[PDB]
Amino acid sequence: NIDGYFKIYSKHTPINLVRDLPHGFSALEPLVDLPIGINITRFQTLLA
Amino acid sequence: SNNLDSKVGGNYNYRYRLFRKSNLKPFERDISTEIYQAGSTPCNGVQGF
Numbered sequence A: 001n002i003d004g005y006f007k008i009y010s011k012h013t014p015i016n017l018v019r020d021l022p023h024g025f026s027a028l029e030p031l032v033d034l035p036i037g038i039n040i041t042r043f044q045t046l047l048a
Numbered sequence B: 001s002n003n004l005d006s007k008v009g010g011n012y013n014y015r016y017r018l019f020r021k022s023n024l025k026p027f028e029r030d031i032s033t034e035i036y037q038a039g040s041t042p043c044n045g046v047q048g049f
């Protein structure tokens, strides 16, 4: 969130590894921008 | 817009913010109506001295 514009960059995998996060380079492409204008101070992710 | 927005007694629907603890940032919108501390007291209810 930057001067009233929220920004998102993201990526998804080729990897089927043992357990922990691989060290490795794939950058996140930009995907969306939203003029939300709010103070975000905190957050929470949503599960199934 | 006097020709449109004014009323002979005064168009008292038009509101602005008069008191704040700090400034707001570039392009911020503050929707709040909580009672302002100019008094040092932990001020609560619809007023305070």
Ligand SMILES: *[C@@H]1O[C@H](CO)[C@@H](O[C@@H]2O[C@H](CO)[C@@H](O)[C@H](O)[C@H]2NC(C)=O)[C@H](O)[C@H]1NC(C)=O
Pocket (backbone or CB within 6 Å): A039, A040, A041, B024, B025, B028
């Ligand atoms: C967004 O809301 C937060 C939470 O109230 C604000 O952070 C507080 O700011 C006051 C004044 O500096 C402090 O007394 C609190 O301790 C702060 N809380 C935290 C978590 O740091 C924040 O300033 C607001 N953002 C904007 C742009 O006004």
